[PDB]
C-alpha cells in the first residue's frame, strides 16, 4: 500500500484544437502538457483544477467536466500521483505565457505526442472520443513505461 497525493490536469479541448502548455521549469519540463498542479487543502478537486488552470494559463472558467483519473508511480518514489483529469466546458479569455507554462494551440491532427508525456499517447485519444477513463502508469524516469493499465469507464 502506497500513499497518494492529489493533482489536477485540465485539457482545454475545443472542436478542432487543444491548448497545451510547454513546461518551462520543474517536473516534466520541456514537454507539452495540460494545465494543473497539486490540490490544496479545503478546495474541491474541481475547484483546484480551475485554480491551477487560471494560475498556469491565465484562463478562467466557471465549470469543468471530469473525464478521467490517472495514477502515476515512479521508480524510487514511494508516493503515487493521483491525477484527476478535466476538460473545459467553455472559455472566455486568452492564454498567457508565464514562468511555468507557455501555452499554444494545436490542431487536432497535429497533437504533439512525441513531445508530451508518453502516457498521453494512450489516454488522450479517449479524451478525443469523449470516453471516460481510469489509468495507471509506472515510469522509470521520465521516458520509460514499465507497466500500465487503461480502462474505459462509465463514471470517473
Ligand atoms: N505522466 C504524466 N502525464 C501527464 O499527462 N501529465 C502529468 C504526468 N505527470 C505529471 N503530470 C501533470 C500533472 C500535474 O498537472 C502536473 C504536476 O503538478 P506539479 O507538481 O507541477 O504541481 P504544482 O505546481 O502544484 O507543485 P509545486 O511545484 O509544489 O507548486 O503535471
Ligand atoms: Mn501550478
Ligand atoms: Mn503545474
Ligand atoms: Na500549485
Ligand atoms: Na507546477
From Swiss-Prot:
Its cofactor is Mg(2+). 8-oxo-ATP binds at residues 27, 35-38, 52, 56, 117-120. Mg(2+) 2 binds at residues 52, 55. Optimum pH is 7.8-8.2 with 8-oxo-dGTP as substrate, and 8.0-8.5 with 2-oxo-dATP as substrate. Its EC number is 3.6.1.56, 3.6.1.-. Binds 2 Mg(2+) ion per subunit. Residues 3-132 form the Nudix hydrolase domain. The N-terminus is blocked. O(6)-methyl-dGMP binds at residues 8, 23, 33, 117-120. The keyword Transit peptide applies. One of its GO terms (molecular function) is O6-methyl-dGTP hydrolase activity. Changing residue 45 to K: Loss of activity. Keywords: Cytoplasm, Hydrolase, Magnesium, Metal-binding, Mitochondrion, Nucleus, RNA-binding, Transit peptide. Monomer. This is Oxidized purine nucleoside triphosphate hydrolase. It comes from Homo sapiens (Human).
Amino acid at each position: 500500500m502506497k500513499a497518494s497525493r492529489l493533482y489536477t490536469l485540465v485539457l482545454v479541448l475545443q472542436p478542432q484544437r487543444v491548448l497545451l502548455g510547454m513546461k518551462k521549469r520543474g517536473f516534466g519540463a520541456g514537454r507539452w502538457n495540460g494545465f494543473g498542479g497539486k490540490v490544496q487543502e479545503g478546495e474541491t478537486i474541481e475547484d483546484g483544477a480551475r485554480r491551477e488552470l487560471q494560475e498556469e494559463s491565465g484562463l478562467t472558467v466557471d465549470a469543468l467536466h471530469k473525464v478521467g483519473q490517472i495514477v502515476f508511480e515512479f521508480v524510487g518514489e514511494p508516493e503515487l500521483m493521483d491525477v484527476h483529469v478535466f476538460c473545459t466546458d467553455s472559455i472566455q479569455g486568452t492564454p498567457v505565457e508565464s514562468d511555468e507554462m507557455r501555452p499554444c494551440w494545436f490542431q487536432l491532427d497535429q497533437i504533439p505526442f512525441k513531445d508530451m508525456w508518453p502516457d498521453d499517447s494512450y489516454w488522450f485519444p479517449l479524451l478525443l472520443q469523449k470516453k471516460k477513463f481510469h489509468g495507471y502508469f509506472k515510469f522509470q524516469g521520465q521516458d520509460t513505461i514499465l507497466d500500465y493499465t487503461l480502462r474505459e469507464v462509465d463514471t470517473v
